[PDB]
Amino acid sequence: MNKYTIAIDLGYGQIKGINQDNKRVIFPSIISSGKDRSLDTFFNSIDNIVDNIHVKILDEYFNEKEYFVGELAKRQPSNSSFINRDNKINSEENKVLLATALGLLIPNDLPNDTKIHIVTGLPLEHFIKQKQALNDMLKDFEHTIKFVDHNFSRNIKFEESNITLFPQGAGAIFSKINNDISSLLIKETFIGLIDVGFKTTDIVVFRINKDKEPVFEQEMSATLDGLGMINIYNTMDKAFTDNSRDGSKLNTEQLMLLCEEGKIFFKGDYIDLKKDLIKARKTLSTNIINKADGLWGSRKNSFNSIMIAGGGGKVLYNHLKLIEPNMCQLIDNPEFANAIGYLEFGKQF
Amino acid sequence: MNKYTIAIDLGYGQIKGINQDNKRVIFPSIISSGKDRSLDTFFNSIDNIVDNIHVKILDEYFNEKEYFVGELAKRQPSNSSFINRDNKINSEENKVLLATALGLLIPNDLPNDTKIHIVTGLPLEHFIKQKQALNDMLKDFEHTIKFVDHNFSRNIKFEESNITLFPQGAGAIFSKINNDISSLLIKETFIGLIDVGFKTTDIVVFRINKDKEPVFEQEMSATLDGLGMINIYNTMDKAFTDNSRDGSKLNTEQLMLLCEEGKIFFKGDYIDLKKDLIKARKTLSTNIINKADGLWGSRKNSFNSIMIAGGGGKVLYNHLKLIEPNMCQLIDNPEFANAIGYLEFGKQF
Amino acid sequence: MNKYTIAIDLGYGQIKGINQDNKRVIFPSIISSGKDRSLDTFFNSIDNIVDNIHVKILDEYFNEKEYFVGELAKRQPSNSSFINRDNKINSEENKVLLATALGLLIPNDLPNDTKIHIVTGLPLEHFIKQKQALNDMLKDFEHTIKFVDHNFSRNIKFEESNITLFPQGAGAIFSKINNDISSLLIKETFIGLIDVGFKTTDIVVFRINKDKEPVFEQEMSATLDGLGMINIYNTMDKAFTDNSRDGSKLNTEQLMLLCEEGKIFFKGDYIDLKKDLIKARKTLSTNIINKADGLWGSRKNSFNSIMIAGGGGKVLYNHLKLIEPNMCQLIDNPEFANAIGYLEFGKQF
Amino acid sequence: MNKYTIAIDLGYGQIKGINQDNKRVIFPSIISSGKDRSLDTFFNSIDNIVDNIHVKILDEYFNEKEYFVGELAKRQPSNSSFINRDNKINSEENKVLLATALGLLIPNDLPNDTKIHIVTGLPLEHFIKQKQALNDMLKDFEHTIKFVDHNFSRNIKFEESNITLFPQGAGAIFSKINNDISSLLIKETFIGLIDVGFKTTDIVVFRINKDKEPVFEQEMSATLDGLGMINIYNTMDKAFTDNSRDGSKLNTEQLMLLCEEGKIFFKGDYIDLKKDLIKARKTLSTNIINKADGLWGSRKNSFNSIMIAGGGGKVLYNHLKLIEPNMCQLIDNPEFANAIGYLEFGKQF
C-alpha cells in the first residue's frame, strides 16, 4: 500500500485533529502525572477511550513516564496550570500532547507500507519565525505509545519526507470551502477567514485574481498575539474574585467550566457573573474589529465573504457579527477547520 | 565591439520596454516600499517575475532601499499616488521605474567589450524643455539592482554616447512603419499618428516629400497637455461618489479597475457605471477630434491613413473612429508603439 | 549577500574549473614568461582567450609580471619544466595557476559588496597534511589580474567564509550522483570511485548504511602517489629513444602529444609506438586493480557500482574495465568529475 | 454557461478531429517553418484552408512563431521529419498541433461565457502513466491563434473541469456502437476492437457481463508499441534504396506517397515496388494476428464481433479479416473511430 496521512492541530486551547480516514479526535490541552487505575475501572466503565487517556510513553533511553492527559488531566487538581503554559514548541509537554493523537488516529494493524505523513501547523507570523524548531523536533521524534486500560502500542517515529507544515487556517479556505465558494468568488474580491483561538487569534484573507485563483495577503493578515479566548478567562477570574471577595480562586477546571457556563457552582451556590460574561465577550470581539480594520483600510469595501472559525468564534458569532452583517457567516466546524484545512490542503501529499 | 540596446518608455500610465532580443516587458508606474517576503512564497507562485517585483536598490553610497513596483506595488495600501505622481524625470521614483525595466531586459553575462545603449522618450513639447535634466540623470546613473526572491542582479552604470534622447512618438512612424508604409504613401501627403498617452496625448504628423521621405511639421503636431486617460480616471471618480452618495473614494487599485471595465464591486454588491464610461470616453474622443482640427484645416483633407497609438488608443477606437472614417486605423501594438518605435529608430546608431 | 561560487581544481596535469553559472574551462598547468604579442596579433586572430592566455598579474606591491600560461606556454620551448614540477601548493606556479582560472571564470557585472565562494581541492591522504598550507595561501591571496589581448581585468582577493576545502573525489560521488545513486544504493554496500589523474591516483569508497546515508571508510581508501598517467609519459619517452635507435628524445610538447596518439611525426616521418602505448596503458591498468584490491579484500563483493574519474580513466576505461565488469562504469565528465562535485557540495554555504 | 464540445486526437500519423457540430477535420501530423505566402496567393486561389494552414500562435508574453503545418508542411523539404516526432506529450510539436484543430473547429463568434470541452486521448498503456503529464499541459494551454491568409483569431485557454480524458480506442466501442450492438451482444462474450495506428496498434477487448453491459479486460488487451504503419514506411524506404542501388533517398513526401501507392515516380520513370508493398501488408497483418492470439487463448472462440479501425485498418481490412471470417468487420469511420467515440461519450459530461 501507500503511506498514511495524519492532520492534527497544536492549538493551546484544545488539541484537535482528523486523520486520512475521517476519524477525528479532540481534547483540551491539559496534561498531568499518571497513576495506575484499577479501582475506578471497577466502578465506572471507560466507554470512550479519549475520555480517560492514561498513557505511558516509551523511549529507547528508558525514560518512560505515566501521564494523565486531556479530560483525565482536567479532573486532576495537580495537573498543568494551563494559564501560563510555555509556547516552546520543542518542549517535552508538547511531546505528550502530540504523541497522544498519533495512536488515536492510527487504526489497528496498519502494514509497514503505511508511513504517517503528519501535517501540523504554526501561527501565521510564527510560521516562518518558528518553522525550524518544530522541524527539528519532528525530525527528532522517536517514541512508542502505551494505552493504559486499552493495551495497544504504536511505534511512532518520523523521517523526513513525512512531515508537512502549513500556517494556521491556510488551507481552511484555500481548500475545504474553495470548491464551494467558487459560486461566490468572482473577480478581485477578498474572502475573509478568522480563527479565534485560546492564546492567539488569526485573521487571514486571500485575494483572488482575474483568473479566479486565490493569492495571499501578508499585509492584510497577521497574528493577534495576546488577544484571544484566554483574555476572557483572565477577565472572568478577576470578576470572580470581585464577586467572591475572599481571595479564593477557581482551579484549572472551574475556570474552564466558567466561560462555557457563566454560573460557577461555588460553596454549594451559583455565584453568578452573567452580565460580566457578556461584557467580556463584547470586549474581545470589539478589540478584533480594531485589529481587523488595522489591517483593513478602504479595502474592506471589496469583501464578499467573511468566515469565522475557532472555538472562540463559536461563542463570539453575534459578538463579531458587527464587522459586516449579511456577509459574515460560520464555517461548518469552527474548531476543526484548522485540522481539515491541514488535511485537505495536506492532500497535496 | 557593438553595444547592446534597450528601449524603454517612461510613460505615466505604464512602463513599457524592449531590448535587442525583442523580449518585451510591461508594468504599471506604481511603486511601493519593499517588505520582507518569505511567507507569501509558501502560499502562492513566484514564477511570474513581473507580478512579484520585490527589489533591492544599491545607491551611489551603496546602501540598500528595497521597493515594490507595479503589480506587487498595486496591491499595497501605501503605494505611490499615481494620480498626481510627479512629472519630474529626475525623481527617485523615476529612478525605481528606470532601473527596473532595464533589469528584466539586460541579458545574463553580456560580453565585456559590449556595453549598453538606452533610447528613451521625452514629451514633444518638453523635448527641447526637459532634455538636459534627463541627460544629466542618465549620465549620473550608477546603481546596482538586485531582484529580491528571484535572486539575480545587475550593476548598471552609463556613460555619455550611450544614452539617446528622442521625443515621445518620434520613431514610432519614422521607423517601425517605414518598411511597411512604402506601399501605402503616395506623394506630398500626411499620415496620422495619435498617441493617446495617460496624462498627455501626443499628436505627430509627417509630410512625405517628392522623394517619398517623411519630413516633420511641428505646426500641425503638438502635445495635448492635460488631455488623456487621466481625465477618464477623474471623470468616473465622481461617478462612483455620486452613485454611492457616501464619500466612497476608490483606492488606486479600484480606480484603474473601474475605468478598465466600469463594473466596480463594492461591499457585497456591484456598482455598475458602464453607461457613464461611454460618456467619459465620448468626452475624451471629442476632446481629440476638436483639437485635431486646430492642427488640421483643409490640410486634413490630404491624408492617406490615420493610425492611433497609446494604451488609451486601444479603448477609444470605436468612438475615436469619427476623426476620419475609412482612413483611420489602429497600429499593431498600441502599447508597444513607443518602445519599438524607440528601438528601431534607436538602431540608427 | 548573494555570494557567487567558483569551483576549481589544482590538478598537476591540467587545471579544471567551473563557476556558479556552469561556465567551465580546461587548460594545461604550464607557465612561462609573457612577451609582447603584437607581431602575431596582426598575423592570426587572437580569438580563443583560453588558447591564448597572455596574462598580466599584479601583486600587493604592484609588481606586474606578464605570463604565457596554458596552451600558449606549452607552445613555448622555454616553458615550465612540468614533469618534475614541485608539489608545493604555495608555489608561485600555483599562485599563477589558481589566479589564472579565477578571472577566466569571474563573470561580468558583479555587485559592490558581493564576494565569491571559492571551492578548491587537496590530495586525499595529504588533506590532513596540506590543509594549513592552502589555508595559508588562500588567506594570503591579494592580487590583481589583467588580460593582455582581450582588454579586461578583474580584482582578486579573498578571506575566510569564501574558502571551501574538500578533498579530491570527496564531493564527486557524494553530490553529483546524490539523488541518482540514491535509487541504486540500498543497504550496506560500497560505491567505488577511482580518480586516475596525471601524477596521483585516488581510491575512495563510501559505505552506505541502513538509513541510505553514505559513510566514509578511510582504510579502504587511499591516494596512490607515484601511480598515474605520469608513468606512461615517462615510460614511452625512453621507448621513443628505443624505437628511434639514435638516442634522440622528444620535447615537453611532444611528451603530451605522444600518449594522446602514439604516432609522433619525427624527422619527416611518423615514428610508430602504438604497440607500446597499448602495453603501458594495460600495465598501469594492471597496477590500479591490484592496488585497488590491496584495500579491497572480499569487500569487493560488497560493491554495487564503481565509477572512475580523472582524465586518465576516460582513456583507460577499456583496460580499467577489469575491476568488476558491468559494475564498473565511466562518469559522464571524466575531467570535470571533481569540479561539479566541488560545485554542488561546495554550495552548502 | 453551457460549454461546447470538440473531440481531437494526438495521433503521430495524422491529427483527427471533430466538433459538437460533426464538422470534422483531418491533416497529417507534420509541422514546418512558416514563410510569407503572397506570391502563391495570386497564382493558385487558396480555397482549402486545411491544405494551406499558415498560422501564428501567441503565448501569454507576445511571443509567436510562423508555422507551416500539415499538408502545407508536407510540401516543405525542411519540415518535421515525421519519423522523429517528439514523444514528450508537452512538446511544442504537440502544442501547435493541439491548437491547430482547435482553431479550425471553434466556429466564429461564440459567446465568451460559452467554453469548449476538449476531449483527448493517449495510447492505452501510456494513458494512466502519462495522464498527469497531459493534465498539466491542458491547464498550461493558454494561447491565441492567428491564421495567415484567412485571418480569424481564437482565444484558447482552459482549466481543469473543461477537459476530458479517455484512452485511444476506449470510447470507440464504449460509445457509438455500445447502444447499437445490443442485438449482437448477449452474454459473457468478447467484442473485438483493434485500432491500427501509425506508430502503435492498439488491442482492446470488452467482456460483456450477465447484465448485457461491457466490462474491461486488461490482460487480454495491450498496446503494441512499435507495431503499426510506421513499420511499412520504414520497410519500403529500404526497398527503394535497394532497388535504386544508388543511395537515392525519397523525401518525407515521397515516403507517404509510396505506401499509399507502391508506385513512386523517380527521374522520368516509375520505380516499381508494388511487389514489396504486397510484402509489407501481408507481413504486418500477420504480425497483428500473432500478437492478438498472444493475448487470446481459447477465448478467441468466445468472440462475437471483431471491429477494426485506424487508417491502417482501412488499408489492411482484407488481410486483417483472417482472424475470423464473418466476424472481422470494419467500423464506419476508420480514421474518426476515436473521434466520434470521444464525442458521444464526451456528451456524458
Ligand SMILES: Nc1ncnc2c1ncn2[C@@H]1O[C@H](COP(=O)(O)OP(=O)(O)O)[C@@H](O)[C@H]1O
Ligand atoms: N462550547 C463552548 N463554550 C465556551 N467556550 C468554548 C466552547 N467551545 C470552545 N470554546 C473555547 O474555544 C477555545 C478553543 O479554541 P481552538 O479552536 O481549539 O483554538 P486553538 O487552536 O488556539 O486551541 C477554548 O479554549 C474554549 O474557551
Ligand SMILES: Nc1ncnc2c1ncn2[C@@H]1O[C@H](COP(=O)(O)OP(=O)(O)O)[C@@H](O)[C@H]1O
Ligand atoms: N485593457 C485596457 N482597458 C482599459 N484601459 C487600458 C487598457 N490597456 C491600457 N489602458 C489604458 O491606457 C493607459 C496606458 O497608456 P500608455 O500607452 O502606457 O501611455 P503612457 O506612455 O502615457 O503611459 C493606461 O493608463 C490605461 O488606463
Ligand SMILES: Nc1ncnc2c1ncn2[C@@H]1O[C@H](COP(=O)(O)OP(=O)(O)O)[C@@H](O)[C@H]1O
Ligand atoms: N583525450 C585524451 N587523450 C589522452 N590522454 C588524455 C586525454 N584527456 C586527458 N588525458 C590525460 O589525463 C590527464 C588529465 O587528468 P586530470 O583529470 O586533469 O587529473 P589531475 O586532477 O591529476 O590533473 C592528462 O595528463 C592526460 O594525459
Ligand SMILES: Nc1ncnc2c1ncn2[C@@H]1O[C@H](COP(=O)(O)OP(=O)(O)O)[C@@H](O)[C@H]1O
Ligand atoms: N488511403 C490511404 N492509403 C494508405 N495509407 C493510409 C490511407 N489512409 C490512411 N493511411 C495510413 O493510416 C495512418 C493513419 O492512422 P491513424 O488512424 O491516424 O492513427 P494514429 O491515431 O496513430 O495517427 C497513416 O499514417 C497512413 O499511412
Ligand SMILES: [Mg+2]
Ligand atoms: Mg487554532
Ligand SMILES: [Mg+2]
Ligand atoms: Mg506614451
Ligand SMILES: [Mg+2]
Ligand atoms: Mg584529479
Ligand SMILES: [Mg+2]
Ligand atoms: Mg489512433
